[PDB]
Design an enzyme around this catalytic site. Structure first.
Site, PDB file in Angstrom:
ATOM      1  N   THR B 170       0.975  -1.109   0.435  1.00 35.47           N
ATOM      2  CA  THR B 170       0.197   0.170  -0.030  1.00 35.47           C
ATOM      3  C   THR B 170       0.802   1.355   0.033  1.00 35.47           C
ATOM      4  OG1 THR B 170      -1.874  -0.942   1.238  1.00 35.47           O
ATOM      5  CG2 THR B 170      -1.574   0.973   1.059  1.00 35.47           C
ATOM      6  N   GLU B 194      -4.470   1.764  -4.905  1.00 31.56           N
ATOM      7  CA  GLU B 194      -5.912   1.379  -3.767  1.00 31.56           C
ATOM      8  C   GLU B 194      -6.299   3.007  -3.876  1.00 31.56           C
ATOM      9  OE1 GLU B 194      -4.038  -0.465  -0.875  1.00 31.56           O
ATOM     10  OE2 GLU B 194      -5.333   0.790   0.086  1.00 31.56           O
TER      11      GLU B 194
END
Lengths: 138, 358, 358
Positions: B170, B194
């Site tokens: 992430t 993301e």
């Protein structure tokens, strides 16, 4: 049925039929030195226009240049490109034309190479391979 | 008929028998030439000895396939008919598949007629006609010690460092790389995968100034952290940081924005984030193999399924499209073809977003 | 031509399959070969591996589409065809049109030879074309402490004020586009879709002339509430507004409508309905960003999903698109690059539907 290089030599007789400061460097690069038997005199009529100074265009040039050189240079204007040209398309045709001669350097001497075949020589006739295979490695 | 293409490359290398004599045998060759060719192509290795067509022109003229191959014409015309030298394996496979044909014919044809022959034996005929078939280099990281026990980060790499939903993949790209673009000059073309960049610009600055834990999402900051935000504000927008966030597409958003900037900024890295909802996987994963080939520089590709190779070995190419596949559990290693097998540890906090050194 | 000199680079690179299936796929090849050439061009380098003529001659000869396509009689003619492998782009952005020649010719030769159908159901052939042919800085924000905060509305912004049920979203429209028309000649328009626009005209006249407690939603008042009428419509008619309740719309309306409403009105803001009806919800926000960039005025489209940015997500997309998301519990304007983002709610009266700042 036109081969690979015949069009890379044409990567000039159209890139200098439409842009002549994309033709001054050819004097430096491809003198030449040109490949084809009638494509030398075409260049000989290109650079000579750069001196007098008149209206340069796709079709204004190709009449200087009387007959035969028009169902040829006009057919050099029935093409499908543009005037957005790279630095590594300018460093590309550097090999192309002037080196197609070196593709020849594995033909006329093969006539000799293959005539060592007829005498059953494979002792020394099996060496010109290195003066061929590892000759194209430049 | 791959054979023609299969035999004429042990000249270009010439040791194009390093894998070719580590694979098959002369039998696969139907014509009496190619066999007795490769049969006498397999007497060199006794020392040995090494590799030359002449070591075979004193070998197929010695055991007279001189008058039993295709003559001189057909000998050199093998050096003259194989171009792509990096195959070999390969390549030689289709012949074994032409020989997979051969692996069946004089096995089945035997049996098909055995109802007119072994008539008779049958149980004998059975269990036999069946048991036949029984076969630094080294583009940076910030914590310099991390372009070392692996050695970059270098031209043409699908550097994948993956993790589970919001663990490492992430924000991992917001750490190591902000020392290749902000610290040294090897710029980027980024993609937030993301979130939008509005949330992917709100995750990396957390590292600088000890900021974003009070927080910024709800409120603002305290007096001394503005005099620490003003010490963290000008290394993103000002910096050569140019992310892209475009929604459900195949892959073209990269190359539609990563071709014009080949000549402009410089291109020292190309950045990629999460995978499993950008609309199987390899036609999006190989879209980055011949990309670092064309643009020519190290690239980061964070995928999703442990992560071991095995659990991302069915939801992505990963093992193949990338030799290099680091992880995010620590940065777990798996397959490296660039440096020594030294393992490392840097501790992760989980709040201010920082993988602070040991 | 634009095809009769294409495939060479895929041998000259040869890993030039990435800029091919770049903007393209295996179908953009009429000539019976190039298509399943490229299909045989994908799954091969879909390993793997990368690329070379031979590996191409493999799966074609496998699908025996070398008995079905022709043979090697083209391989040498296409290996020897390209006089420079840098065109590439190009040529996939100039040969697009060549097969794009017939993207709306398939979807049009249909309806023409399909007048011979809907006759019957007539009308419906509209939506086949829709889905086969088809495809204060500033003009004021809302409040003065909300126009010394974020600052706007400026040139070109997609906005979404994800408004709560139960609490309210009625008077927010009666305090973002109630006084902005009735002061300066950057006029507006009001989209009130699902309800008839005229029931919504008991909301802002009963909030501009402060008369809504006798009452102004059902007939003859007692000889009294005909008092503060001189402030309701006495400013809302010397401006320029188009209130709305036209069908369950898609969004290409406000593209054809806004090509002749930028030239029909005066334009300062464009107030569109909440982002959770127009259709199938996520697609609408994505093409609502550009809308602020056409008429040269920022455009509004609220929502009916705490309230935070992950509830318009349980019904939409938005983040990569809208880059300033305000709210209603509290106008949680928690998004921008301009600077200001804060925690602000306002007081309410609800006998007149009035907002209050301090």
């Amino acid at each position: 049925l036109l081969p690979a290089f015949q069009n890379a030599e044409r990567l000039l007789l159209a890139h200098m039929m439409r842009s002549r400061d994309v033709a001054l460097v050819v004097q430096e690069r491809i003198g030449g030195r040109f490949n084809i038997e009638e494509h030398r005199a075409l260049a000989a009529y290109i650079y000579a226009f750069y001196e007098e100074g008149h209206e340069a265009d796709p079709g204004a040039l190709i009449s200087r240049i009387p007959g035969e050189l028009q169902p040829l240079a006009s057919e050099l204007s029935l093409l499908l490109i543009a005037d957005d040209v790279s630095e590594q398309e300018l460093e590309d045709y550097i090999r192309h034309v002037l080196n197609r001669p070196k593709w020849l350097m594995l033909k006329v001497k093969e006539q000799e190479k293959t005539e060592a075949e007829r005498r059953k020589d494979f002792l020394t006739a099996a060496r010109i391979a290195k003066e061929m295979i590892e000759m194209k490695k430049m | 008929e791959a054979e023609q293409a299969v035999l004429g490359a042990v000249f270009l290398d010439p040791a194009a028998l390093v894998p070719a004599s580590e694979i098959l045998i002369p039998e696969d060759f139907y014509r009496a030439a190619h066999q007795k060719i490769f049969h006498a192509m397999l007497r060199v290795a006794d020392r040995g000895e090494p590799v030359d067509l002449v070591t075979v022109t004193a070998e197929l003229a010695a055991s007279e396939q001189l008058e039993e191959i295709g003559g001189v014409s057909y000998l050199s015309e093998l050096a003259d008919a194989v171009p792509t030298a990096a195959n070999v394996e390969y390549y030689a496979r289709i012949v074994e598949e032409k020989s997979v044909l051969r692996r069946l014919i004089r096995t089945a044809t035997s049996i098909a007629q055995d109802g007119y022959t072994r008539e008779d034996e049958i149980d004998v005929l059975l269990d036999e006609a069946d048991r036949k078939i029984m076969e630094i280099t080294g583009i940076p990281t910030g914590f310099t010690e991390l372009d070392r026990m692996t050695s970059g980060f270098q031209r043409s790499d699908l550097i994948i460092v993956a993790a589970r939903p919001s663990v490492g993949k992430t924000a991992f790209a917001l750490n190591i790389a902000q020392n290749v673009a902000t610290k040294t000059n090897e710029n980027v073309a980024i993609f937030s995968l993301e979130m939008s960049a509005q949330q992917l610009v709100m995750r990396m600055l957390c590292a600088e100034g000890n900021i974003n834990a009070q927080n910024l999402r709800t409120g603002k900051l305290t007096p001394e952290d503005w005099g620490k935000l003003t010490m963290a504000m000008g290394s993103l927008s000002n910096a050569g940081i140019y992310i892209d966030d475009t929604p459900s597409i195949r892959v073209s958003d990269i190359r539609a924005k990563c071709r014009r900037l080949k000549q402009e900024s410089g291109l020292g890295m190309i950045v990629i984030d999460y995978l499993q909802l950008i609309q199987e996987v390899s036609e999006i994963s190989r879209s980055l193999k011949a990309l670092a080939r064309e643009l020519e520089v190290p690239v980061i590709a964070l995928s999703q399924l442990r992560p071991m190779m095995s659990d991302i070995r069915e939801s992505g190419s990963i093992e193949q499209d990338a030799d290099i596949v680091a992880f995010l559990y620590e940065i777990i290693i798996a397959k490296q073809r660039n440096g020594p097998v030294g393992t490392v540890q840097l501790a992760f906090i989980k709040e201010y977003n920082k993988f602070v050194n040991l």
